Design a protein around this ligand. Structure first.
Ligand SMILES: [Mg+2]
Ligand SMILES: [Zn+2]
Ligand SMILES: [Zn+2]
Lengths: 77, 146, 48, 91, 289, 62, 1116, 193
């Protein structure tokens, strides 16, 4: 029930840096928002929320929850 | 004629044009000195240039002679009657109608400079207090698309 | 004296001003600024 | 955006930027409040005051943009161009 | 040493292709008109920028010089015009670098080209490094002890005007408002339905509090908003010394991060619970005394 | 550009014109003028270029 | 007798001199300018009493200064003999509402006399309206109340400064004579062991060449100066010799470029200094040079003479040579010493009379030039005094004096004390004076001379600290401009009941005792040892019969606002500054209440200020009513005072006036008839007196915040009216006129519900933000309709109506009940500006209640914002159930060093619950017994003067014997602390808590004004970023220091959007707005507009600033 | 109480604010009170100017490398003023030597106590003073040899997080703010000239 609901220490050890984490959650949040705005096209490349979602929610909040599970993977190019 | 929106040295140069005019139209056949002939042309060049170059918004020469004429008579009315004259009483003295009096009063102002201090604080400038209209308001633009 | 000595002198001198009051600034903060002052070099006998 | 080169602007360079030449100290007519010809604020050199409207009143509509009206020489385009286009004074 | 200083300027000319002749300008460029506006002012008056006056003088003096050169004129008269023309151009580029400035009305020096590019009020230090911003607000601050470290109170009216686009979008989706203009009217009137919608949208959306001097990086700190009646920002008493804020009376600005990257930064980097220790010496700052 | 935004704004402008100095835009103060991303923190090449894809086991579930 | 309500005073020393007419500073100065009957009556009284005063007025003086004008032939002359006034055309009340400058006519008799014609034609002329000053010292110009504040300036004269040169290792001495009008002159000795002169700092030159330029020859020079080797050394080293030679040489140095001419060289020296026009040294200027140089009675009015310049050299060398006392040349013996500019003998205030006189002198100076030019081009016998003089410059100068000047300031009417303090303010800043940038440490600092003439405690705490100061309580102005102060006269060790007004220089000579110094039953000094002050601010004592003056009152050094504070001596000087400054910000309340404990000066400060309405006759009230009150004098004459009622002040607060007298009460002159804003029974009352308890309480009053019981909001204890006024104008434009009308287009039916018939909101119609006050519609617009709009006009059966809505609307974040509307019509007899056909003003009034954020404060510089308003049950109550109205943190009090507020609290409890001392025979009581403050009833006021207040033994003792309020118990212990039952948990607090009654003010930093927000709004034109301020819906400034913080955090994305998306990018701003409402992701920012503007400006200085890509030209 | 222009009065204040000052005592006290208010406003101005100039020169110092290649450090005294037969640590060990990473190991008994490339903390500094080593060589920002900015190892661990500094942090802006923040708090001058 707060911003601090996914703890930061668990998130930090997954990404090994701090600046890496913010862009990584933000890139994912951009994707999931873009998925919700298909409105009927149903393009294959986009992927929806992996975890369950509240009736109203912020896409960035969903993204951070996915990192804590650790299912999502990031790679620098 | 200094201190009327024209720089003092600028007045000399414009009057200097009047002098070169005068010598081309002067001769000894008239029994008079050059000084009396020259001063007419000097005054002409200075006053015409003052009409044509003092104001930021240019006023035609004949409108300029109208406003300074009415200004001087308004000064005489204030001194004589001991009270600020009404535009209608000023109008009959000019022989024009009151609507023309109101019109010429509206043309006889001067702009105020944008880059001026408000005076409450030194840093603030007048030009940072007036909004533009040409900006596209975001709420209205998206509504048209809808 | 030398470049190392002036680094020691500058960091030590400015720190006593701060420590006189009671504020505490770690020496790395001082050291970064002093590194920036010593970067250039003045050329003499620029023949070659 | 790779480098912000700066240098001395020669006389030909100044003329190259210019879209015209100012020839009068005129700014705006005292009665109609519209810009004059070949002075400061002139639409022939800087740009149209109103979007796609020229000076004389020909070619008011949006359709025939990107043309130069033969009467007053104003090139119809957006009014925002006045913020970009610049002239020059010959000495 | 005289040859040493002189070498500096002259060597630069030979290596560079550009010729020294750029010192003496033949044609004076003019600023585009929108950058020196003759804006109408309410009340029938007018407002003009000082560049117009300075441009007017150089045009006037150049025009008269053409007249003097055209007819046969002496050396004394033409020299004075050339002298005044040179002085006029000088005033335009840098007013006050030689003798008295062109005061114009007499009450104040006229602004100049270089004057826009100089000082604390210059373009560099007033409109390029630091700008005013949309989606921002201001109010006095009070102490709220019942808050958590990562929470701040946001007044109802203040938050409504900050989050106006977001409230309108939700009002349309929840069908309380028909269309975008009808949504706009509803929030401006302040109807009862808006407040229910507002609490739904502010949640999990940080806001950056900020006090005016902002000496060190803990001056700006993100917080989780929370609606509160009244008109004063509630703030957490532990974080007072980082802001250096007492409650005599102290207005604190409120900014809103918009995009996905920006609000992510406020949650991770700038949050008020990940800034326990002062970066100066690694000492605790969030236990005032 | 960064030097001009400091105390001197005439001497630096004047000699830069003479010297004809092209400003490479690497740096912090000059990247705030243009509106680009500052090379500090998230604005770095390495942090800003990363990509996010889910795992195969994540796609396998839903 | 019954002029004031009874207030027991704790003072111990009787006061010889009563407090003067507190507004005399402004009124007496302006009386001099008019030269009216009242001032000249004072002149004849002063002459018969022996007091000096200028017998010549102010206005006629500048006429007498302007000699009759003479052309090159000297044929003609214009004498301006007599001036006179007429009654003002507009009444004072009429002026404020109808926007008319309060003024009166000024006629003057011009006499034309021609020697050639031998004829005299006298004729009266009219020079224009003169803005007059009402009886409370404010100039009502253009419907707004202005006040002109005094101005401190360096007096003209000679000033000698001694300095030390580090290279020379020896002292250097300089002299400078700074005149009122002419160029200035300097005389610097031993720069490199020779003496030299600066003639307007044109060039270095010697003194011998200056003297040789004068008629003095080398032979006579050396007899006067042969005993001082500096001038002898300078003489032999000076190669030039001869009077003619020296004169031409200085001509070359001063004005290069022309060949020397004997006559032209000679007239320049006469012109530069000795000419009576180019070097008009002021009357104070001549007066000061005679005092410094010691010459006994030279010419009273005129320029400097050749005697003075040579005397100034003599003073310089005698000062340099080390002798400290020397006989003045052709004058009495005088001390030779350096003089400090900051000392008040050298600082002069230009009171309001002198300020306007300088401006009217400039206006009349321009008038003089015109008649000279006119005379050369006019023939004789066609010249009359009516036509030749143009009065246009004179009126234009006195009109431009009030506008755009730092001395004619907008009056602040927050409460009567803000009014009073603004009259007495002494502004160092202004034209021809000390500016902010020239300011140094020395001017701001307190001086020893300041005692009795300028309060050191109060001054603004802002950037102009010390530059602005308030006049002292007893200060009086010398006619030259210096500030006097009274002193009692002492002779043979007996203090006499006579008062002498000493200036800042005559004070220096003598030794002054202290009012606090004990005095016997007889007029002798009780103790041989007595504290005194002397030259240079010494504080050393000098026992026995040596003094000659003593201070008249211990409150002498403190101003009106500082005298308000009780227990001032216990407070620190720093916090007292804040306390005196706050009290000029307290807003008036609905029902004002007099302070329970407070100094006796609050009553006098109210009556002298003009808000309370006092009687001018001794009569019987006959008809009492809210609007007006009728009184009848013994002769039979009736005068009806018309009380103001709910009229807006300058800062937007009520100035509502109550009526205090009943129907048949007898009145005496000066007694108070009507109560004013923030007043009670004629006593000043800026706040209420609440029950305070000192304890931390759950953290709600942490770090200076305040806790308030909900009783105060409920019982209307702290609530203030606020009256806003906003107006619109129906101007005639090119396309047509604007119409004030009800038929606004494209509006619903219920929005224009409370509008009246002609399109004005009805009286009493409660409004909200966004509501329409007066309906107004623009005449036309040129609409180039898009195809969809064209379709819509057909579909809805609309009419465009060729109009757009521009109606006046209630500003954002504003509520209120309309109370009054004024309408001015062109077609009516009403006068309007050009263009405006109709003008309408609407007064919206609201009743603000005390809420969180609203700044609150006491008297001793303790201030805080309200943090929480608990319910009445939650408040920590007393043993008898009484909940404390306000809590205050104790953590603040020791550190800030203002224990005066604790002392006030203890005495406040005693005032609320009375005390009994009868037959107790105690030592502390004995001083009080003659005072009479032994048997005191509950609720009664008590007075403790600002430096003769009750001592701490009395308060400790008084606390011991407080009356039991009910049932027989005293709720407060002897220590001044009481038992507090926690209201929330119920269980008693473990130890006692200090409690009492404290006087609390409500400041004008209310939260309702401060709250601002912005989604998107206006933008500036030249640079497209939003404009600032609250009145124009302005975004907050993300300055330079702010972006450093984000760079330290590394948050690059947040910084980028703050500079491009959220401002200064026209293509990007609309894109983000549509993206938010559609839910789509935010787009990428472009380049800002200010950067593009920068390129254009730098391309206009002839620098080809090229944006480039790696491969040639760049993309934008 | 300090008279104007930094002088002392010979006749000091004998009364306390509880006891209540006398008239002349109050007047002399004002000389120092007003001066302090005026001076404080000036120190804010100069401290602001100092911070602004510092930020310009201190920018372009960014952490842009995980570890430098070099071995040059700086020798700091962990412990000094050691009385006879005892070892006493340095008074300012916290601000000076803490949160730095050793350039090279330290051997006193032939065995490494604190190995190289280990940041120092409370536990490690205790180990070195107990064994009795009197100095240490810690890698530091001065001797960094990075072609662009400064490596993370030479800067050592940051202080706001208690871990090694991240790549891309702007150490330069942090240092400038830290020096300039207590500038207003300094306010020191000779009591009397
Ligand atoms: Mg504060
Ligand atoms: Zn056309
Ligand atoms: Zn390194």
């Amino acid at each position: 029930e707060g911003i601090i609901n996914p703890p930061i220490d668990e998130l930090l050890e997954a990404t090994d840096s701090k600046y890496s984490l913010v862009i990584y959650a933000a890139k994912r949040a951009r994707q999931i928002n873009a998925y919700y705005s298909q409105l009927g096209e149903g393009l294959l490349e986009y992927v929806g929320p992996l975890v369950d979602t509240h009736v109203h929610e912020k896409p960035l909040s969903i993204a951070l929850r996915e990192i804590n599970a650790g299912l999502l993977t990031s790679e620098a190019i | 004629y200094t201190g009327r929106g024209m720089l003092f040295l600028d007045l000399i140069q414009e009057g200097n044009l009047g002098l070169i005019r005068a010598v081309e139209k002067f001769d000894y056949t008239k029994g008079y000195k050059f000084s009396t002939y020259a001063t007419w042309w000097i005054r002409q060049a200075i006053t015409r240039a003052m009409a044509d170059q003092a104001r930021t918004i240019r006023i035609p020469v004949h409108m300029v002679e109208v406003i300074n004429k009415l200004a001087r008579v308004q000064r005489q009315m204030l001194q004589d009657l001991g009270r600020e004259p009404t535009p209608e009483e000023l109008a009959k003295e000019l022989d024009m109608t009151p609507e023309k009096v109101i019109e010429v009063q509206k043309y006889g102002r001067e702009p105020i400079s944008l880059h001026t201090p408000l005076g409450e604080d030194g840093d603030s400038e007048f030009g940072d207090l007036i909004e533009d209209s040409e900006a596209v308001v975001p709420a209205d633009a998206v509504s048209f698309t809808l | 004296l030398g470049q190392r000595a002036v680094q020691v002198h500058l960091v030590g001198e400015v720190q006593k001003v701060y420590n006189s009051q009671g504020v505490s600034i770690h020496d790395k903060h001082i050291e970064i600024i002093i590194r920036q002052m010593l970067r250039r070099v003045t050329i003499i006998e620029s023949g070659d | 955006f790779d480098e912000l080169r700066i240098g001395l602007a020669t006389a030909d360079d100044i003329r190259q930027w210019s879209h015209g030449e100012v020839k009068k100290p005129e700014t705006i007519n005292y009665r109609t409040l519209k810009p004059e010809k070949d002075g400061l604020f002139c639409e022939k050199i800087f740009g149209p005051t109103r979007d796609w409207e020229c000076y004389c009143g020909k070619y008011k509509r949006v359709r025939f943009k990107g043309i130069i009206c033969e009467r007053c020489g104003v090139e119809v385009t957006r009014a925002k161009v006045r913020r970009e286009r610049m002239g020059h004074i010959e000495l | 040493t005289r040859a040493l200083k002189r070498l500096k300027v002259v060597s630069a000319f030979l290596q560079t292709s550009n010729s020294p002749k750029g010192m003496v300008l033949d044609c004076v460029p003019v600023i585009p008109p929108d950058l020196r506006p003759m804006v109408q002012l309410d009340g029938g008056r007018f407002a003009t920028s000082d560049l117009n006056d300075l441009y007017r003088r150089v045009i006037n003096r150049n025009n008269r010089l053409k007249r003097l050169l055209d007819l046969g004129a002496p050396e004394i008269i033409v020299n004075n015009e050339k002298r005044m023309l040179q002085e006029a151009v000088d005033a335009l580029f840098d007013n006050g670098r030689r003798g008295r400035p062109v005061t114009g009305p007499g009450n104040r020096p006229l602004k100049s080209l270089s004057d826009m590019l100089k000082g604390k009020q210059g373009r560099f230090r007033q409109n390029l490094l630091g700008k005013r911003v949309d989606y921002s607000a201001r109010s006095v601050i009070v102490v709220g002890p019942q808050l958590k470290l990562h929470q701040c109170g946001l007044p109802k009216a203040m938050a409504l005007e900050l989050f106006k686009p977001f409230v309108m979008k939700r009002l349309v989706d929840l069908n309380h408002a028909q269309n975008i203009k009808s949504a706009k009217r509803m929030v401006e009137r302040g109807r009862t339905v808006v407040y229910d919608v507002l609490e739904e949208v502010i949640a999990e959306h940080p806001v950056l509090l900020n006090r005016a001097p902002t000496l060190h990086r803990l001056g700006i700190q993100a917080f989780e908003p929370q609606l509160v009646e009244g008109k004063a920002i509630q703030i957490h008493p532990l974080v007072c010394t980082a802001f250096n804020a007492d409650f005599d009376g102290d207005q604190m600005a409120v900014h809103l991060p918009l995009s996905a990257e920006a609000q992510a930064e406020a949650r991770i980097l700038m949050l008020s619970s990940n800034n326990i220790l002062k970066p100066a010496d690694g000492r605790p700052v969030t236990m005032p005394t | 550009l960064s030097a001009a935004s400091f105390q001197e704004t005439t001497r630096v402008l004047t000699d830069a014109a003479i010297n004809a100095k092209s400003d490479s835009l690497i740096g912090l103060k000059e990247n705030v003028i243009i509106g680009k991303l500052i090379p500090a923190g998230t604005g770095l090449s390495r942090y800003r270029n990363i990509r996010v894809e889910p795992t195969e086991e994540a796609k396998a579930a839903m | 007798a019954s002029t004031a309500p009874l207030r027991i005073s704790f003072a111990k020393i009787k006061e010889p001199l009563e407090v003067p007419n507190l507004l005399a500073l402004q009124t007496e100065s302006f009386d001099w300018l008019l030269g009216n009957d009242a001032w000249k009556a004072r002149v004849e009284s002063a002459l018969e009493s022996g007091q000096d005063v200028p017998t010549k007025s102010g206005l006629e003086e500048i006429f007498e200064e302007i000699s009759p004008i003479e052309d090159f032939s000297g044929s003609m002359s214009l004498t301006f003999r007599d001036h006179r006034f007429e009654p003002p055309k507009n009444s004072i009340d009429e002026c404020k509402d109808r926007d008319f400058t309060y003024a009166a006519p000024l006629f003057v008799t011009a006499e034309f006399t021609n020697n050639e014609t031998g004829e005299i034609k006298s004729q009266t002329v009219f020079m224009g309206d003169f803005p007059l000053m009402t009886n409370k010292g404010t100039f009502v110009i253009n419907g707004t109340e202005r006040v002109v504040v005094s101005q401190l300036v360096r007096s003209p004269g000679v000033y000698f400064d001694s300095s030390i040169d580090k290279t020379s290792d020896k002292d250097i001495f300089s002299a400078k004579i700074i005149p009122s009008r002419g160029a200035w002159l300097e005389m610097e000795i031993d720069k490199r062991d020779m003496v030299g002169v600066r003639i307007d700092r044109k060039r270095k030159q010697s003194v011998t060449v200056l003297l040789k330029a004068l008629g003095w020859t080398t032979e006579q020079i050396l007899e006067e100066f042969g005993e001082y080797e500096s001038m002898r050394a300078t003489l032999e080293k000076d190669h030039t010799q001869g009077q003619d030679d020296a004169l031409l040489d200085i001509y070359r140095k001063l004005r290069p470029g022309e060949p020397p001419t004997r006559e032209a060289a000679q007239t320049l020296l006469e012109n530069l200094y000795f000419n009576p026009k180019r070097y008009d040294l002021a009357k104070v200027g001549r007066y000061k040079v005679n005092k410094k140089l010691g010459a006994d009675e030279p010419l009273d009015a005129g320029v400097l003479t050749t005697d003075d310049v040579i005397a100034t050299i003599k003073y310089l060398v005698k000062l340099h040579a080390g002798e400290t006392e020397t006989v003045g040349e052709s004058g009495r013996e005088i001390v030779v010493e350096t003089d400090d500019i900051d000392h008040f003998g050298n600082r002069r205030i230009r009171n309001v009379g002198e300020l306007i006189q300088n401006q009217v002198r400039t206006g009349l100076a321009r008038m003089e030039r015109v008649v000279r030019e006119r005379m050369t081009t006019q023939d004789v016998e066609a010249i009359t005094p009516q036509t030749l003089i143009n009065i246009r410059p004179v009126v234009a100068s006195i009109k431009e004096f009030f506008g755009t000047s730092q001395l004619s300031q907008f009056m602040d009417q927050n409460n009567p004390l803000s009014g009073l303090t603004h009259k007495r303010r002494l502004n160092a800043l202004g034209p021809g004076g000390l500016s902010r940038e020239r300011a140094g440490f020395e001017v701001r600092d307190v001086h020893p001379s300041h005692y009795g003439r300028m309060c050191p405690i109060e001054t603004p705490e802002g950037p102009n600290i010390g530059l602005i100061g308030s006049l002292a309580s007893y200060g009086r102005i010398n006619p030259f401009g210096f500030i006097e102060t009274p002193y009692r006269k002492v002779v043979e060790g007996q203090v006499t009941d006579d008062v002498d007004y000493l200036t800042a220089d005559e004070e220096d000579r003598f030794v002054i005792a202290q009012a606090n110094a004990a005095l016997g039953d007889d007029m002798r000094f009780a103790e041989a040892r007595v504290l005194v002050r002397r030259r240079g601010g010494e504080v050393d004592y000098v026992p026995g019969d040596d003094v000659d003056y003593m201070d008249v009152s211990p409150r002498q050094m403190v101003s009106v606002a500082t005298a308000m504070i009780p227990f001032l001596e216990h407070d620190d000087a720093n916090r007292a500054l804040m306390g005196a400054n706050m009290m000029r910000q307290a807003v008036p309340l609905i029902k004002s209440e007099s302070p329970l404990v407070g100094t006796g000066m609050e009553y006098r400060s109210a009556a002298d200020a003009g808000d309370v309405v006092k009687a001018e006759k001794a009569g019987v009230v006959q008809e009492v009513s809210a609007d007006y009150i009728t009184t009848t004098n013994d002769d039979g004459t009736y005068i009806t005072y018309r009380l103001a009622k709910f009229s807006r002040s300058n800062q937007g607060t009520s100035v509502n006036q109550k009526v205090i007298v009943a129907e048949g009460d007898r009145i005496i002159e000066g007694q108070v008839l009507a109560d004013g804003p923030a007043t009670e029974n004629g006593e000043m009352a800026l706040g209420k007196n609440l029950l305070v308890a000192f304890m931390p309480w759950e953290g709600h009053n942490y770090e200076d915040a305040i806790i308030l019981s909900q009783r105060l909001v409920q019982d209307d204890v702290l609530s203030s009216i606020h009256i806003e006024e906003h107006e619109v104008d129906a101007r005639d434009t090119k396309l047509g006129p604007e119409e004030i009308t009800r038929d606004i287009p494209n509006v619903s039916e219920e929005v224009l519900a409370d509008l009246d018939e002609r399109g004005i909101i009805r009286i009493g119609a409660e409004v909200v933000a966004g509501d329409i006050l007066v309906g107004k519609v623009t005449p036309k617009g040129e609409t180039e309709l898009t195809p969809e709009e064209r379709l819509l006009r057909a579909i809805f059966g609309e009419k465009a109506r060729e109009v757009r809505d521009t109606s006046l609307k209630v500003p954002h974040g504003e509520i209120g009940k309309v109370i009054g509307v004024r309408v001015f019509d062109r077609e009516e007899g009403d006068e309007l500006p050009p263009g405006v056909n109709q003008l309408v003003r609407v007064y919206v009034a609201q009743k603000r209640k005390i809420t969180d954020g609203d700044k609150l404060a006491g008297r001793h510089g303790n201030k805080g914002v309200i943090s929480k308003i608990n319910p009445i049950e939650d408040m920590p109550f007393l043993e008898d159930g009484t909940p404390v109205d306000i809590i205050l943190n104790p953590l603040a009090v020791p550190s800030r060093m203002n224990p005066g507020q604790v002392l006030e609290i203890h005495l406040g409890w005693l005032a609320s619950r009375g005390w009994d001392v009868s037959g107790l025979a105690e030592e502390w009581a004995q001083r009080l017994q003659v005072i009479g403050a032994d048997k005191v009833e509950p609720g009664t006021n008590v007075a403790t003067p600002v430096f003769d207040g009750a001592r701490e033994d009395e308060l400790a003792g008084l606390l011991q014997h407080t009356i039991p309020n009910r049932d027989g118990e005293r709720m407060v212990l002897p220590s001044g602390k009481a038992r507090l039952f926690d209201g929330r948990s119920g269980e008693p607090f473990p130890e006692p808590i200090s409690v009492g009654y404290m006087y609390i003010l409500k400041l004008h930093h209310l939260v309702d004004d401060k709250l601002h927000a912005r989604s998107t709004g206006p933008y500036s034109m030249i640079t497209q970023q939003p404009l600032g301020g609250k009145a124009q819906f302005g975004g907050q400034r993300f300055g330079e220091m702010e972006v450093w913080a984000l760079e330290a955090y590394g948050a690059a994305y947040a910084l980028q959007e703050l500079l491009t998306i959220k401002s200064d990018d026209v293509t990007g701003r609309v894109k983000v707005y549509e993206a938010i409402v559609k839910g789509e992701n935010i787009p990428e920012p472009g380049i800002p507009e200010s950067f593009k503007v920068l390129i254009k400006e730098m391309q206009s200085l002839c620098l080809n600033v090229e944006v480039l890509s790696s491969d040639g030209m760049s993309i934008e | 109480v300090s008279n104007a222009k930094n002088e002392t009065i010979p006749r000091p204040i004998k009364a306390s604010f509880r006891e209540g000052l006398s008239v002349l005592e109050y007047f002399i006290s004002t000389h120092g009170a007003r001066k302090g208010l005026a001076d404080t406003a000036l120190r804010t101005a100069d401290s602001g100017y100092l911070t602004r100039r510092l930020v310009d020169v201190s920018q372009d110092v960014i952490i842009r490398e995980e570890d430098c290649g070099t071995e040059r450090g700086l020798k700091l005294p962990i412990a000094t003023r050691d009385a006879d037969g005892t070892l006493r640590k340095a008074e300012d060990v916290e601000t000076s030597v803490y949160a730095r990473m050793l350039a090279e190991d330290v051997v006193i008994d032939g065995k490494v106590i604190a190995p190289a490339n280990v940041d120092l903390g409370d536990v490690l500094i205790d180990a070195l003073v107990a064994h009795g080593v009197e100095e240490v060589k810690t890698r530091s920002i001065l001797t960094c040899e990075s072609q662009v900015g400064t490596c993370a190892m030479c800067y050592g661990r940051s202080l706001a997080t208690g871990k090694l500094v991240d790549i891309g942090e702007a150490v330069g802006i942090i240092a400038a703010q830290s020096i300039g923040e207590p500038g207003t708090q300094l306010t020191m001058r000779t009591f009397h000239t």
